[PDB]
Design a protein around this ligand. Structure first.
Ligand SMILES: NC(=O)CC[C@H](N)C(=O)O
Ligand SMILES: NC(=O)CC[C@H](N)C(=O)O
Ligand SMILES: [Mg+2]
Ligand SMILES: [Mg+2]
Ligand SMILES: [Mg+2]
Ligand SMILES: [Mg+2]
Lengths: 11, 438, 438, 11, 11
């Protein structure tokens, strides 16, 4: 995903 | 009401040294920008700049630049120098309000409601929360703070009484508390507010969540507004008692009919019932929310209204006069107050201007009814999962009109991503049921 | 501004009993010489002697003798008798400033800039840091102080709230704080300063690092400016908003053009883009720094500029007037502020006096592009390792001119030694991937 | 039971 | 190395 940093909660 | 001079005087006399410019995103999270009091003038000139893309939550891509315009009527000083807060609206660089801000969206919905002749939309929430014990490391455990029941006097007087301290601190802050009581589940509590206008009510809900989470931490506890933290016990709801007013007068009150309900109230509840599946995702935005929407714990599971029932979607309290209201019980404390209130108001107005006919109220002989007979009668079921709730939301136009295109699309994308991440997990229930039987 | 009499009066009234003669080395470490207040006169006579070779860091060989010349305008008294500090320049035994001192190098670069007609170079930094919990033995762990998100109101007013205490203590010391907020990653925080002149800005950065590390230790926490302490979450950056001024007037502001940028600003950003590979090693001096320069965490990975993009190397904020500036986003908080600022200023001036043409800004349709297509368009990539960054730095003349021969050679030697020590280690990733598959 | 939530003490 | 004492962090 392009916004990997904003999706860190799910990963 | 407050002006710039009042704010300066309050800062000077109370020795305010810290300012919190408070706002919210589409997920209901309380966001804020911290500022030293020396920046107060720049705060009052609507010149504070911030990212603005944080409103998008976890689906933000590019950093923007947006201005914060404080609302001086929301000024309040925390009792913990001192710290003060101001609730701010988000404006774009062109001087117009950002279309992705839930507060501005609710204000726009209220403004368009005012063209129908109604002047005020009053809301009284019933937020319920859970208090869990903290361990040595400071993490929340699964043990409750007490073991009380419905309306019990469990945290009696001596040693924590977290609910009493929360109520007293809210009263000191200038809030209007009606009553508080212990909830059905152990460690579950409810605090009720007096009715207020829509924007003020949602701001009070946000401030109440912040204050509860602070005070629970003060008492070595953890406060959660999760809809269903524990299996097998009651969940937490945020029932919304709403009332319409067109000029010093309740529009839902009929002083002649012995029922005391105006045809406007019937149209409003018909509209809310019609679009209930549409706004279920907004009012129940979490995956866990639909674990509360299960039978047996007073949470509504199908679309119906009643004056006396165990779990109706809409309840009409026996109060009349200026206090007659309609209670929507599907809302949970995890929902964004602005978006949920806007959706409910839009559904009610859609029912009002279409002159919809409210279906027959349900009574005791619905408890012995399967889903087939319930649907044959005409009672639809609420969506059972966030996936199906999003599916239903994508087919409703009223929710899109209520939210605006930007908020609608961002919410759908965020919830789709959340469900996609949730669905790939292998649960402990699956490992318990399978891996030995298969 | 202060004089000797002001310093003596401050020492007498405030009962200062300890003096810290503070300076920095080529690695950005805050070094100091401690002195009793009875030596104050000897401090003011520029007669304090010290090794001076400590400026070289860990590549020092022979002990020298060098003098400390305090800058009286940097006088400040810590809020913790009392302790005061003075930032001192390093002088050789022949009365001339030491060529290995980063502060003197930045002053020389500014003085040579002043011959081009410009008078001021203002910097506003955006340093981000992480707060970790300490264990019983007092060592830092990998657990964060909170669990908030972007612009969250995560640390409540009751409890530690290290960020608020840091902001208030900096305000008491005489700093100019613009705003503070929670960062994207949990336990990550950002405090923003108002713009100041170059030397003052770098001194403020050093003092801010010292104050943050002290106050975090007060709250039983550990503050780190490591560029990438944790894998899979956002790193910490130190974005530099720079602006040029030639006399009570921003040289970047064009009051007639709709975009509002002068040709000088375009030349400056073209020069920064041209030499971005040259100064990457100085702006990202650690091995860990290049673990932040990976896609998906808003850190820049290729050489481009934009007004609205997820991770551009150069961003132009929408502010105009006297506040128009250019934001270089590749700098991390581990870099030496003096050296990084000197390199950026030298690159900008090289672009200015060569009348370079800025390339086209990038927009949303660059997210779908491989490295081959990006290079075909003309977008170069930043070095991915400290080894390749040093290789690129050895081929750039602008960075050598900015740093001076002594600082350039010492930095190259230090970083080569550091990389040589790092490259021979066997990581746990190798032992997990291999040792069973091979 | 219909009132499952109110009988949680027994289950 | 000549400056063994100054390189103790790496050894
Ligand atoms: N009876 C009550 O007020 C509790 C309501 C229940 N907690 C719900 O989720 O709706
Ligand atoms: N969005 C932000 O301000 C965070 C930037 C990010 N921490 C970086 O390393 O650049
Ligand atoms: Mg209740
Ligand atoms: Mg109720
Ligand atoms: Mg940042
Ligand atoms: Mg930035």
């Amino acid at each position: 995903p392009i916004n990997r940093g904003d999706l860190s909660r799910f990963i | 009401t407050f002006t710039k001079e009042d704010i300066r005087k309050f800062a000077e006399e109370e020795n305010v040294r810290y300012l919190r410019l408070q706002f919210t995103d589409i997920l209901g999270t309380i966001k804020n920008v911290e500022v030293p009091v020396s920046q107060l003038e720049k705060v009052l000139d609507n010149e504070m700049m911030f990212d603005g893309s944080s409103i998008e939550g976890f689906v933000r891509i590019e950093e923007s630049d947006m201005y914060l315009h404080p609302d001086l009527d929301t000024w309040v000083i925390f009792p913990w120098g001192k710290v003060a807060r101001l609730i701010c609206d988000v404006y774009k660089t062109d001087g117009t309000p950002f279309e992705g801000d839930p507060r501005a969206n609710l204000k726009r919905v209220l403004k368009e409601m005012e063209d129908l002749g109604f002047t005020d939309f009053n809301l009284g929430p019933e937020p319920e929360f859970f208090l869990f014990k903290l361990d040595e490391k400071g993490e929340p455990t699964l043990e409750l703070n007490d073991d009380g029941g419905y309306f019990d006097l469990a945290p009696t007087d001596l040693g924590e009484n977290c609910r009493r301290d929360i109520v007293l601190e809210l009263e000191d802050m200038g809030f209007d508390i009606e009553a508080s009581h212990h909830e059905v589940a152990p460690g579950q509590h409810e605090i009720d507010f007096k009715y207020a206008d829509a924007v003020t009510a949602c701001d009070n809900i946000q401030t109440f969540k912040l204050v509860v989470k602070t005070i629970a931490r003060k008492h070595n506890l953890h406060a959660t507004f999760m809809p269903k933290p524990l299996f097998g016990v009651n969940g937490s709801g945020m029932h919304f008692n709403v009332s319409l007013f067109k000029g010093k007068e309740n529009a839902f009150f009929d002083p002649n009919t012995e029922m005391g309900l105006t045809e406007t109230a019937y149209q409003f509840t018909a509209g809310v019932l019609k679009n209930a599946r549409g706004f279920t995702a907004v009012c129940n935005p979490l995956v866990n929310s639909y674990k509360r929407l299960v039978p047996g714990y007073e949470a509504p599971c199908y679309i119906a209204w009643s004056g006396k029932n165990r779990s109706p979607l809409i309840r009409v309290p026996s109060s009349r006069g200026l206090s007659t209201r309609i209670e929507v019980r599907s809302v949970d404390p995890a929902a964004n107050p602005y978006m949920a209130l806007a959706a409910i108001l839009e559904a009610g107005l859609d029912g009002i201007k279409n002159k919809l006919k409210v279906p027959e109220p349900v009574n005791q002989n619905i408890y012995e009814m399967n889903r087939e007979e319930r649907e044959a009668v005409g009672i639809q079921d609420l969506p059972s999962t966030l996936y199906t709730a999003l599916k239903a939301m994508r087919e409703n136009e009223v929710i899109k009109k209520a939210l605006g295109n930007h908020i609608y699309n961002q919410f759908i994308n965020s919830k789709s991503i959340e469900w996609d991440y949730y669905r790939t997990q292998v649960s402990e229930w699956e490992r318990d049921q399978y891996m030995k039987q298969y």
